[PDB]
C-alpha cells in the first residue's frame, strides 16, 4: 500500500511508472509519498507551508526517485534520503555548504 501525489510540474513518465509498479498504487490529495520535480512556485508549496511539514509529518521527495528506481534492477537500493527535495529558498545555501572546502565552511 503506497499512496502518492504529484505536483503539476512532474513528467507524465514518472507518474506512469508510479501507476505501473510499487505497492498498491493510489494517488490521493494527502497520500503517503509526496513527489515533485520543483520547489519554486508549483503545487508543492502547499506541502511546505502545511502544518504537516512544520510538524515533521511531510517530506517532499524529488520525483526522479522514480526514474532512479526504473533504472535500478526492480525496487531494491535507491534510498529515499538522496531525493529529499527541500524548499527552493534553501537549495542555494545547501549546495554551497556541501560543495565548500574544509578550509572554507562559511556560515
Amino acid at each position: 500500500g503506497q499512496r502518492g501525489w504529484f505536483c503539476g510540474s512532474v513528467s507524465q513518465d514518472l507518474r506512469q511508472f508510479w501507476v505501473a509498479e510499487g505497492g498498491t498504487i493510489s494517488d490521493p490529495r494527502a497520500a503517503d509519498f509526496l513527489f515533485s520535480c520543483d520547489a519554486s512556485h508549483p503545487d508543492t508549496l502547499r506541502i511546505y507551508q502545511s502544518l504537516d511539514y512544520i510538524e515533521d509529518n511531510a517530506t517532499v521527495f524529488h520525483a526522479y526517485y522514480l526514474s532512479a528506481v526504473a533504472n535500478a534492477k526492480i525496487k531494491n537500493s535507491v534510498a529515499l534520503g538522496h531525493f529529499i527535495l527541500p524548499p527552493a529558498c534553501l537549495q542555494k545555501e545547501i549546495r554551497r555548504k556541501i560543495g565548500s572546502f574544509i578550509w572554507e565552511q562559511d556560515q
Binding site: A58, F61, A79, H82
Partner: protein, 60 residues
C-alpha cells in the same frame, strides 16, 4: 555502513515516516546533516511568523 536516509531502502518508509527517521538516527552523513538543519530553519521561520506577524497581540 549505517546512516539513515542512505540506507533508506526498507519498505514502508515514506514521506510521513522519513523526517522522524533521520531525527531518530544516531549517525547522520554530512549531506543529511546539512539538509536537516536547512529544513529546520525553514520550519522555525514559519512558526515564528505565525507567533509574530506584525499585528498579533499576546493578551489574557
Amino acid at each position: 555502513y549505517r546512516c539513515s536516509g542512505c540506507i533508506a531502502v526498507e519498505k514502508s518508509l515514506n514521506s510521513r515516516n522519513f523526517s522522524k527517521l533521520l531525527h531518530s538516527c544516531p549517525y547522520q552523513c554530512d549531506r543529511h546533516k546539512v539538509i536537516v538543519e536547512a529544513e529546520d530553519r525553514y520550519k522555525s521561520e514559519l512558526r515564528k511568523s505565525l507567533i509574530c506577524n506584525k499585528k498579533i497581540l499576546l493578551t489574557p
